[PDB]
Design a protein around this motif. Structure first.
Motif, PDB file in Angstrom:
ATOM      1  N   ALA B  29      31.916  43.581  53.084  1.00  0.00           N
ATOM      2  CA  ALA B  29      33.231  43.791  52.472  1.00  0.00           C
ATOM      3  C   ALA B  29      33.087  44.054  50.983  1.00  0.00           C
ATOM      4  N   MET B  30      31.893  44.451  50.571  1.00  0.00           N
ATOM      5  CA  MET B  30      31.651  44.839  49.183  1.00  0.00           C
ATOM      6  C   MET B  30      31.226  46.302  49.126  1.00  0.00           C
ATOM      7  N   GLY B  46      39.520  42.595  38.963  1.00  0.00           N
ATOM      8  CA  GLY B  46      40.800  42.699  39.619  1.00  0.00           C
ATOM      9  C   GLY B  46      41.400  44.099  39.498  1.00  0.00           C
ATOM     10  N   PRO B  48      41.349  48.501  39.368  1.00  0.00           N
ATOM     11  CA  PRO B  48      40.991  49.495  40.368  1.00  0.00           C
ATOM     12  C   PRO B  48      39.678  50.235  40.174  1.00  0.00           C
ATOM     13  N   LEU B  49      39.091  50.545  41.339  1.00  0.00           N
ATOM     14  CA  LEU B  49      38.097  51.589  41.514  1.00  0.00           C
ATOM     15  C   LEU B  49      38.788  52.625  42.408  1.00  0.00           C
ATOM     16  N   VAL B  60      39.699  52.389  46.443  1.00  0.00           N
ATOM     17  CA  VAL B  60      38.551  52.160  47.300  1.00  0.00           C
ATOM     18  C   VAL B  60      37.874  50.833  46.959  1.00  0.00           C
ATOM     19  N   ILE B  62      38.029  47.049  44.282  1.00  0.00           N
ATOM     20  CA  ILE B  62      38.672  46.155  43.330  1.00  0.00           C
ATOM     21  C   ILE B  62      37.565  45.507  42.505  1.00  0.00           C
ATOM     22  N   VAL B  63      37.652  45.565  41.188  1.00  0.00           N
ATOM     23  CA  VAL B  63      36.543  45.100  40.334  1.00  0.00           C
ATOM     24  C   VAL B  63      36.229  43.654  40.685  1.00  0.00           C
ATOM     25  N   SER B  64      34.985  43.387  41.091  1.00  0.00           N
ATOM     26  CA  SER B  64      34.733  42.062  41.683  1.00  0.00           C
ATOM     27  C   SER B  64      33.639  41.304  40.943  1.00  0.00           C
ATOM     28  N   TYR B  78      32.313  45.753  43.902  1.00  0.00           N
ATOM     29  CA  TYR B  78      33.744  45.916  44.049  1.00  0.00           C
ATOM     30  C   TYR B  78      34.149  45.409  45.422  1.00  0.00           C
ATOM     31  N   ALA B  79      35.306  44.794  45.590  1.00  0.00           N
ATOM     32  CA  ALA B  79      35.773  44.456  46.924  1.00  0.00           C
ATOM     33  C   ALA B  79      36.036  45.761  47.674  1.00  0.00           C
ATOM     34  N   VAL B  81      37.990  47.997  49.776  1.00  0.00           N
ATOM     35  CA  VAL B  81      39.373  47.947  50.281  1.00  0.00           C
ATOM     36  C   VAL B  81      39.490  48.379  51.738  1.00  0.00           C
TER      37      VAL B  81
END
Lengths: 131, 95, 10
Positions: B29-30, B46, B48-49, B60, B62-64, B78-79, B81
């Motif tokens: 999920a990354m 949190g 966007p990418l 696509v 989420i800054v993680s 990134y998470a 999506v």
């Protein structure tokens, strides 16, 4: 972002700033519609934090920004704080954002969509530009 | 943090390849991106990418998490999506 | 969704 550059103002209209009650920016987020923001679970948002939409220059007092209260914090139950996996939280706004030229939603993908390695994408935000 | 909103273009990596840098930290999920001369960094979490497809931008990642020094030659994480959007849909539906 | 009124530039 390190070694990025300044954005055209208002050109990422889904980008929001998550600020605590002292007005300190601590995370970003993205509007997915007028009532909901998607962010990272590790941002640790609470309903005392604020979603700020429509902002470009956080040093400016002349922008028409929207400071939006948070009704509830939906942290994905799958989130694992030990591995940081499934790092996603939804924020339901107390009052809807007013969509405009500088405030609007990002699209979400289908679960089956393919975004292949080597594809160039974009990230945005007010993170440090030098660590 | 910078006063004005920043942007950077950066490429998506494969997870397999990303594991050359981060090993078993990388889960399904990354999604990794970067290692290209730019880096997300503290305070970007949190956000966007986004990738442009069929003329529109799609979230696509989420800054993680990533390099503690925001190294521009290390991939950011990134998470992913696509792995999370069914939950987003479910949550909006029920609330 | 996904189409900024103010188009981003590079």
């Amino acid at each position: 972002i390190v070694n990025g550059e300044e954005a055209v103002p208002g050109s990422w209209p889904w980008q929001v700033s998550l600020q605590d009650k002292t007005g300190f920016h601590f995370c970003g987020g993205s509007l997915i519609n007028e009532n909901w923001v998607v962010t990272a679970a590790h941002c640790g948002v609470t309903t005392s934090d604020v979603v700020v939409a429509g902002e470009f220059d956080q040093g400016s007092s002349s922008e028409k920004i929207q400071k939006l209260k948070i009704a509830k914090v939906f942290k994905n139950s799958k989130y694992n704080s030990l591995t940081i996996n499934n790092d996603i939280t939804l924020l339901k706004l107390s009052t809807a954002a007013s969509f405009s030229q500088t405030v609007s939603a990002v699209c979400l993908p289908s679960a089956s969509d393919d975004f292949a390695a080597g594809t160039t994408c974009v990230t945005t935000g007010w993170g440090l530009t030098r660590y | 943090t910078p006063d004005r909103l920043q942007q950077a273009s950066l490429p998506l990596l494969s997870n397999t390849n990303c594991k050359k840098y981060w090993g078993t930290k990388i889960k399904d999920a990354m999604i990794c991106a970067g290692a290209s001369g730019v880096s997300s960094c503290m305070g970007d979490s949190g956000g966007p990418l986004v990738c442009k497809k069929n003329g529109a931008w799609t979230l696509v990642g989420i800054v993680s998490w990533g390099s503690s020094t925001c190294s521009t030659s290390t991939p950011g994480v990134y998470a992913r999506v696509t792995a999370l959007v069914n939950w987003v849909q479910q949550t909006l539906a029920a609330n | 969704c996904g189409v900024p009124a103010i188009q981003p530039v590079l």
